[PDB]
Write a protein that binds this ligand. Structure first.
Ligand code: NI
Ligand code: NI
Lengths: 277, 282
């Protein structure tokens, strides 16, 4: 893999938390990056006050998660599936209904695209190497088709080469030859090595406040966290209206601003508190 | 082009005893669906099944016509009417047909699921529908494989007189920009371009037949000029990943529907289901 010192310029748009929309040139660049590379890094999107509260909440929840009889893991030890809280006090419009995120996902997936994931990944100290996989499959084997989903990844601490910054395979989102994927979405080793010779994977630091938007079919893997601190990620995924997903459980205390919006969420509104763990 | 019988190029002649197609027969069926987007399977269903479904839908028509607004497909005389979901009228050879699912499994995958149990009552003196598709392409201006197959069951002999559907062979793969309006109607300029290359067909279809077609196939309902309503039972198989609301079924059929490797997107209800309105309480 190529280990970089910063998000590569070819994949990155630098914003501030004041930016509510991309100008036409910036949106065209964002869409060109997603089309060609399948991964877009947006730095400086979220105020530290939001990421601070989400980081704290997820670190506070981790003991209760680790105390379970069976700790749900992504492929290998140390990659813990952990939903962030869906308390009203930790559900932020600038996270769930981000105007720049939806400007991009509306342009790629259509005005009826909807968020259908509000989840997270806690990468623990001493975690193992995941196999290279896609989070969402191609819809038919051996066929080239456009995107139907965009993962929206929100690091809740600075991601470094040490603490488990994800490995990404740029341009891998369009690859769908026969016999490429097993039943868990892991890439066959022969296809990995063919691809590596043409377009090797990258790992790079991602500062907290960043949002990563990627094609749900992009090849990637979680990697070892060699630091002494858990590395929390908040994960959302926008889908075309026609892709079948179970709804996100949200408290009805956010129904007023979630259900109103032209930034669609596939949501089931629950009376009282939701048990996110 | 008005024909005297289902054309041989679209047709496999079966009997009700045919449970699975031999590999050569299945290859022919799949070649027809791939090229033409419509496959006619004659002689699939026993008269005993079609007789009871026809009777049940004709018996229900008064309750349908009594509604404040009678749901119509585009134009007068094409009435949307769901067949009953009483246990006594839910037949495994209709809902879970082994030849149908052999074909839909081969096209859509082993996880393909029926998500429609509906119907069309074409009344005497009905109007001409616009040419449309029942299910859209998933992205505009893009060629992609099928994600859905309509499974149409005529409940009387369909004739050129009584409103046998017009089908546009090979139209299931067409998806140029600005081809379709918000109702899935084909824009007139695209209709006429297509007609010059591959004009539509209409043909009689004997009761007992099952029509399998790409959900994106261009077609239209046409006038019923007979003295009798022309009932059709409609199902649609989708890829596992296509979002559809479930079919409401009584839990009295859960044992044989939910067991099956012939998947149904079903919600099982404790009482009887109101098939006409869907006004059951949960
Ligand atoms: Ni992953
Ligand atoms: Ni139609």
């Amino acid at each position: 893999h190529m280990a970089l010192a910063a998000p590569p310029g070819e994949l990155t748009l630098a914003l501030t938390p004041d930016d509510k929309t991309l100008d036409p040139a910036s949106l065209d660049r964002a869409l060109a990056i997603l089309a060609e590379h399948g991964i877009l890094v947006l730095t400086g999107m979220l105020r530290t006050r939001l990421t601070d509260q989400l980081r704290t909440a997820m670190l506070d929840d981790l003991p209760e998660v680790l105390r379970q009889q069976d700790v749900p893991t992504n492929f290998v030890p140390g990659h813990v599936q952990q939903d962030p809280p869906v308390r009203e006090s930790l559900l932020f419009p600038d996270v769930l209904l981000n105007p720049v995120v939806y400007q991009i996902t509306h342009a790629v997936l259509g005005a009826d695209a909807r968020n259908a994931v509000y989840s997270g990944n806690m990468n623990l100290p001493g975690s193992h190497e995941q196999p290279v996989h896609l989070d969402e499959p191609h819809l038919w084997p051996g066929i080239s088709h456009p995107p139907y989903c965009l993962c929206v990844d929100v690091p809740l601490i600075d991601f470094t080469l040490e603490n488990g910054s994800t490995e990404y395979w740029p341009g891998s989102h369009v690859l769908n030859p026969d016999e490429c994927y097993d039943e868990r979405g892991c890439v066959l080793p022969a296809e990995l090595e063919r691809r590596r010779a043409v377009a090797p994977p990258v790992r790079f630091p991602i500062p907290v406040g960043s949002v990563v938007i990627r094609d749900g079919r992009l090849w990637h893997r979680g990697v070892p966290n060699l630091s002494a601190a858990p590395r929390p990620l908040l994960a959302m995924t926008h889908y075309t209206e026609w892709f079948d997903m179970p709804p996100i459980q949200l408290p009805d205390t956010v129904k007023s601003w979630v259900d109103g919006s032209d930034r669609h969420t596939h949501a089931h509104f629950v009376a009282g508190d939701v048990d996110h763990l």
